[PDB]
Design an enzyme around this catalytic site. Structure first.
Site, mmCIF file in Angstrom:
data_model
loop_
_atom_site.group_PDB
_atom_site.id
_atom_site.type_symbol
_atom_site.label_atom_id
_atom_site.label_comp_id
_atom_site.label_asym_id
_atom_site.label_seq_id
_atom_site.Cartn_x
_atom_site.Cartn_y
_atom_site.Cartn_z
ATOM 1 N N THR B 11 0.875 -1.170 0.000
ATOM 2 C CA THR B 11 0.000 0.000 0.000
ATOM 3 C C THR B 11 0.923 1.235 0.000
ATOM 4 O O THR B 11 2.084 1.163 0.420
ATOM 5 C CB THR B 11 -0.952 -0.115 1.271
ATOM 6 O OG1 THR B 11 -0.234 -0.500 2.450
ATOM 7 C CG2 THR B 11 -1.994 -1.189 1.004
ATOM 8 N N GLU B 12 0.468 2.324 -0.625
ATOM 9 C CA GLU B 12 1.222 3.560 -0.643
ATOM 10 C C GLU B 12 2.624 3.478 -1.271
ATOM 11 O O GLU B 12 3.578 4.118 -0.828
ATOM 12 C CB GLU B 12 1.288 4.087 0.811
ATOM 13 C CG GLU B 12 0.456 5.324 1.152
ATOM 14 C CD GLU B 12 -1.059 5.240 0.965
ATOM 15 O OE1 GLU B 12 -1.729 4.550 1.745
ATOM 16 O OE2 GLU B 12 -1.569 5.906 0.061
ATOM 17 N N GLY B 14 2.914 4.349 -4.495
ATOM 18 C CA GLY B 14 2.751 5.252 -5.615
ATOM 19 C C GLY B 14 2.131 4.557 -6.806
ATOM 20 O O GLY B 14 2.416 4.940 -7.939
ATOM 21 N N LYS B 15 1.286 3.542 -6.620
ATOM 22 C CA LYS B 15 0.614 2.886 -7.718
ATOM 23 C C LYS B 15 -0.249 3.886 -8.532
ATOM 24 O O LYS B 15 -0.260 3.836 -9.769
ATOM 25 C CB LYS B 15 -0.193 1.789 -7.093
ATOM 26 C CG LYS B 15 -1.035 0.925 -7.970
ATOM 27 C CD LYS B 15 -1.684 -0.205 -7.146
ATOM 28 C CE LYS B 15 -2.527 0.216 -5.926
ATOM 29 N NZ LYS B 15 -1.727 0.000 -4.723
ATOM 30 N N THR B 16 -0.892 4.887 -7.919
ATOM 31 C CA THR B 16 -1.641 5.848 -8.718
ATOM 32 C C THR B 16 -0.718 6.814 -9.467
ATOM 33 O O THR B 16 -0.990 7.157 -10.628
ATOM 34 C CB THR B 16 -2.637 6.597 -7.804
ATOM 35 O OG1 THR B 16 -3.463 5.587 -7.193
ATOM 36 C CG2 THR B 16 -3.540 7.595 -8.553
ATOM 37 N N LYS B 37 -10.748 2.104 -12.292
ATOM 38 C CA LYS B 37 -10.487 1.671 -10.924
ATOM 39 C C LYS B 37 -11.800 1.061 -10.402
ATOM 40 O O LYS B 37 -12.681 1.768 -9.905
ATOM 41 C CB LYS B 37 -9.984 2.891 -10.062
ATOM 42 C CG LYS B 37 -9.595 2.360 -8.671
ATOM 43 C CD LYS B 37 -8.624 3.229 -7.923
ATOM 44 C CE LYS B 37 -8.404 2.719 -6.483
ATOM 45 N NZ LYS B 37 -7.084 2.144 -6.344
ATOM 46 N N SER B 41 -11.764 2.244 -1.859
ATOM 47 C CA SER B 41 -12.242 2.584 -0.544
ATOM 48 C C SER B 41 -11.429 3.794 -0.078
ATOM 49 O O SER B 41 -10.301 4.008 -0.532
ATOM 50 C CB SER B 41 -12.078 1.330 0.351
ATOM 51 O OG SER B 41 -10.771 0.804 0.367
ATOM 52 N N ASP B 54 -7.896 8.705 -5.971
ATOM 53 C CA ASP B 54 -7.156 7.962 -6.985
ATOM 54 C C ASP B 54 -7.949 7.786 -8.271
ATOM 55 O O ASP B 54 -7.425 8.033 -9.354
ATOM 56 C CB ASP B 54 -6.748 6.572 -6.461
ATOM 57 C CG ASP B 54 -5.770 6.709 -5.282
ATOM 58 O OD1 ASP B 54 -4.989 7.652 -5.181
ATOM 59 O OD2 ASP B 54 -5.748 5.842 -4.442
ATOM 60 N N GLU B 115 -6.557 -0.299 -12.448
ATOM 61 C CA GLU B 115 -5.792 -0.150 -11.242
ATOM 62 C C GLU B 115 -6.497 -0.964 -10.197
ATOM 63 O O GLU B 115 -7.727 -0.873 -10.058
ATOM 64 C CB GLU B 115 -5.741 1.335 -10.849
ATOM 65 C CG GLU B 115 -4.666 1.593 -9.834
ATOM 66 C CD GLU B 115 -4.590 3.049 -9.396
ATOM 67 O OE1 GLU B 115 -4.038 3.875 -10.116
ATOM 68 O OE2 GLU B 115 -5.082 3.362 -8.321
HETATM 69 N N1 LIG Z 1 7.266 9.858 -6.901
HETATM 70 C C1 LIG Z 1 6.733 10.322 -5.761
HETATM 71 N N2 LIG Z 1 7.237 11.435 -5.185
HETATM 72 C C2 LIG Z 1 6.696 11.950 -4.078
HETATM 73 N N3 LIG Z 1 5.641 11.355 -3.530
HETATM 74 C C3 LIG Z 1 5.101 10.240 -4.032
HETATM 75 C C4 LIG Z 1 5.650 9.685 -5.192
HETATM 76 N N4 LIG Z 1 4.950 8.613 -5.473
HETATM 77 C C5 LIG Z 1 3.996 8.476 -4.554
HETATM 78 N N5 LIG Z 1 4.088 9.477 -3.675
HETATM 79 C C6 LIG Z 1 3.087 9.757 -2.599
HETATM 80 O O1 LIG Z 1 2.764 8.547 -1.886
HETATM 81 C C7 LIG Z 1 1.371 8.567 -1.520
HETATM 82 C C8 LIG Z 1 0.682 7.349 -2.135
HETATM 83 O O2 LIG Z 1 0.803 7.480 -3.563
HETATM 84 P P1 LIG Z 1 -0.209 6.733 -4.544
HETATM 85 O O3 LIG Z 1 0.122 6.983 -5.958
HETATM 86 O O4 LIG Z 1 -1.617 7.060 -4.259
HETATM 87 O O5 LIG Z 1 0.027 5.226 -4.184
HETATM 88 P P2 LIG Z 1 -0.916 4.011 -4.011
HETATM 89 O O6 LIG Z 1 -1.870 4.079 -5.329
HETATM 90 O O7 LIG Z 1 -0.064 2.787 -3.952
HETATM 91 O O8 LIG Z 1 -1.760 4.136 -2.787
HETATM 92 C C9 LIG Z 1 0.816 9.885 -2.054
HETATM 93 O O9 LIG Z 1 0.863 10.910 -1.059
HETATM 94 C C10 LIG Z 1 1.772 10.255 -3.168
HETATM 95 O O10 LIG Z 1 1.742 11.658 -3.467
#
Ligand SMILES: Nc1ncnc2c1ncn2[C@@H]1O[C@H](COP(=O)(O)OP(=O)(O)O)[C@@H](O)[C@H]1O
Ligand SMILES: Nc1ncnc2c1ncn2[C@@H]1O[C@H](COP(=O)(O)OP(=O)(O)O)[C@@H](O)[C@H]1O
Lengths: 224, 224
Positions: B11-12, B14-16, B37, B41, B54, B115
């Site tokens: 989780t977290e 940066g998948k989005t 998507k 949740s 997302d 996603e």
């Molecule tokens: N390349 C990056 N640089 C800075 N922050 C990032 C980067 N990639 C992800 N984050 C941060 O990490 C958090 C989760 O990113 P997100 O893309 O939503 O991931 P996930 O879809 O896995 O939950 C967000 O606050 C996002 O802005």
């Protein structure tokens, strides 16, 4: 000798806290115990050499009096993957040494807990992982799961990979790494139906030094 | 229609952010794109209903103008596992609805990125996981890996499980979730030899709103 390998779903899930609880429960059942942490990175300088805190925890939760090098033959100062710092330092991690250390402990202990470093797939060289050594030794595996969002996925991934390697998943331990949260019971129920092995016990959130806490009571050694 | 499923090592990771970079690169190659998507949740209340951030990111990085419900048919307010809140609310997540939504997008887009929610093994009911739907649809998989300690293990676990299910691992994306650290190059080299699929690109650490950042340039769509 009974022997078990302890792995975790992620770094920092409390794999050492659960290893100390398991050693305490085994001591309470009457076993002569020994903790073994063959590889460790992330270590302090002392007059006697580098000492790792997790290995020190296993050393003093063992019922036998053991020398540090017996508990942890490979010690590296930097907290990174073993294969990186091993290559940097020019000190190969040898499978024969890791196995000779486990046999040495088997001469004096009848219950030995082997703690890995990191997660299941931690590389020890470019062609050799921790999982390769565990499969070689045919050790039964105990999985420690931190109860948090993300752990269902990681517990399922690790459980499936161990079973694909033909190893026995002996059981799992739930470790409460955070305070009481809203979906704790539903996470515990999901984890119990999805991990194909008995839940050995649940360690509560313990704010002060949980490695020195008396936690053996949370483990039911009769399911191992 | 080309279709790809995007999953993450944790989780977290940066998948989005990586999904928006992939959609941007596809738009730049001339594809009519759609992000999907199906389950989300962790959502905000608006006059029009619950909206997930997302899914909103995927909606406005799509080259087509799409309605929100088309992008995200299942929206739940609480940020927990889909099977828990689905059961709480009395709203089953149906495989037929998830598949009908993907076909609906295939009528207008020729490049569709799907996603998932959470990691590989996210449960959608007590007898059905996200992985079951992906295997049913025979979607090729893109793995997003946050470059941090712990990710080598999680990337290897996820890659092995996908290949055991008979699915194609199309490629992986490295995402720099933290600032420049000491073993970044050695982590990238290890990840490249151990993941059996091409590295599509690396997204740098971007401190401000990286979902709205122009990140398509970091992705080499020619390896997909
Ligand atoms: N390349 C990056 N640089 C800075 N922050 C990032 C980067 N990639 C992800 N984050 C941060 O990490 C958090 C989760 O990113 P997100 O893309 O939503 O991931 P996930 O879809 O896995 O939950 C967000 O606050 C996002 O802005
Ligand atoms: N039950 C717990 N209650 C409070 N803190 C915990 C608990 N379990 C683990 N922690 C903390 O998490 C950190 C990592 O724990 P540790 O046992 O060393 O895990 P690991 O061996 O996976 O690295 C330590 O600071 C530890 O004190």
């Amino acid at each position: 000798s009974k022997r078990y390998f302890v792995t975790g779903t992620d770094t920092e899930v409390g794999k050492t806290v659960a290893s100390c609880a398991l050693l305490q429960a085994a001591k309470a059942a009457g076993y002569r115990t020994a903790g073994y942490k063959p590889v460790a990175s992330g270590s302090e300088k002392t007059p006697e050499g580098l000492r790792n805190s997790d290995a020190l925890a296993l050393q003093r939760n063992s019922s036998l009096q053991l020398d540090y090098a017996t508990v942890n033959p490979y010690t590296f100062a930097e907290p990174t993957s073993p294969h990186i710092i091993s290559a940097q330092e020019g000190r190969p991690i040898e499978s024969l040494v890791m196995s000779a250390g486990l046999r040495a402990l088997e001469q004096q202990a009848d219950w030995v807990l082997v703690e890995g470093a990191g997660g299941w797939f931690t590389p020890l060289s470019d062609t050799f992982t921790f999982a390769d050594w565990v499969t070689q030794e045919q050790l039964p595996v105990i999985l420690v799961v931190g109860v948090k969002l993300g752990c269902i996925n990681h517990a399922m991934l690790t459980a499936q990979v161990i079973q694909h390697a033909g190893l026995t998943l002996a059981g799992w331990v739930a470790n409460d790494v955070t305070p009481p949260g809203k979906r704790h019971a539903e996470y515990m129920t999901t984890l119990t139906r999805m991990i194909p092995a008995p839940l050995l016990g649940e360690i509560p959130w313990l704010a002060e030094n949980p490695e020195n806490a008396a936690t053996g009571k949370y483990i039911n050694l009769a399911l191992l």
